[PDB]
Amino acid sequence: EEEDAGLVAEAEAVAAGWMLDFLCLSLCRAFRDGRSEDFRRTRNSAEAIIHGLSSLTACQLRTIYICQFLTRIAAGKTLDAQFENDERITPLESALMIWGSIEKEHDKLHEEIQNLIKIQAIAVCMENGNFKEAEEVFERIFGMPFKSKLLMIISQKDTFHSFFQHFSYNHMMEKIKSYVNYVLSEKSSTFLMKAAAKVVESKR
């Protein structure tokens, strides 16, 4: 009876791991395609499945971080959303923290996405007339040429500055979609998606 219950709990953990990978793939695809409602509904399913998982492998933790990162990026302009216990941290600042924690290569694309999130974390505050909040985000992030140009823009209250058009919110999303395309290629061969694709193809 206890041995049966134990084997059942272990099978539930295996199935939850398969569901996590499938939901991550689905969330990546909705983000890449710009399918906002599908992204919201998939995010809800991913959060619930994660609360039913206890011990995680390093691979499963990386998968959860990717889901959390995309969720904060999708909420990047929602300055009312609180993703951290410290209520001062904005959504893009929370995405930056996760981006620096993921066990992944720090290639040129990694640093380009990092620097675009830093610029946009300030830009989104400026565009909402939150000038003092922009200076506070700047202080939490930045602690030289890059840094001093941003402080000058904040002090002038230059919301529609040409600098934010060169390193725009759209450019940040496009670079992040390039990374998401690599995660999609990597996770497309996971168990639940492979098995479902084989079923669909067998009916063609």
Ligand X SMILES: COCC(=O)Nc1c(C)cc(C)cc1C
Site string for its own copies, 179-198 (x = CB under 8 A): ------------xxx-xxx-
* Spatial CA neighbour of 17 closest among 43, 65, 56, 69: 56
Alpha-carbon distance 60 to 55, whole Å?
9
Smaller CB separation from Ca ion, 16 or 79: 79
The DSSP annotation for 132-199 comes to: HHHHHHHHHH---HHHHHHHHHHHHT-TT-THHHHT-HHHHHHHHHHHHHHHHHHHTTSHHHHHHHHH
Out of 63, 68, 90, 120, the residue judged to bind ligand X by CB under 6 A: 68
| Tokens standing for residue 11 | 């099978």
**Binding flag, residue 8, its own copies (CB under 8 A):** yes
Smaller CB separation from ligand X, 158 or 186: 186
Smaller CB separation from ligand X, 76 or 153: 76
68 binds, among Ca ion, its own copies, ligand X, none (CB under 5 to 8 A by kind): ligand X
What residues contact 165, with CB distance under 8 A and at least 6 apart? none
Out of 18, 38, 47, 77, the residue judged to bind ligand X by CB under 6 A: 47
- Work out how close the CB of 186 gets to its own copies at its nearest, in angstroms, rounded to a whole number: 16
Q: Is the CB of residue 157 less than 8 Å from the CB of residue 126?
A: yes
**Binding flag, residue 95, ligand X (CB under 6 A):** no
What residues contact 128, with CB distance under 8 A and at least 6 apart? 79
Total residues in contact with Ca ion, by rule CB under 5 A: 1
Give long-range contacts, CB 8 A cutoff, 24+ apart: 55-60.
55/13, 57/17, 58/103, 60/17, 60/20
Out of 50, 116, 137, 183, the residue judged to bind ligand X by CB under 6 A: 50
- Work out how close the CB of 74 gets to ligand X at its nearest, in angstroms, rounded to a whole number: 10
- Work out how close the CB of 140 gets to Ca ion at its nearest, in angstroms, rounded to a whole number: 14
**Binding flag, residue 125, ligand X (CB under 6 A):** no
- Work out how close the CB of 123 gets to ligand X at its nearest, in angstroms, rounded to a whole number: 23
Q: Which residues make up the interface to ligand X (CB under 6 A)?
A: 43, 46-47, 50, 64, 67-68, 71, 83
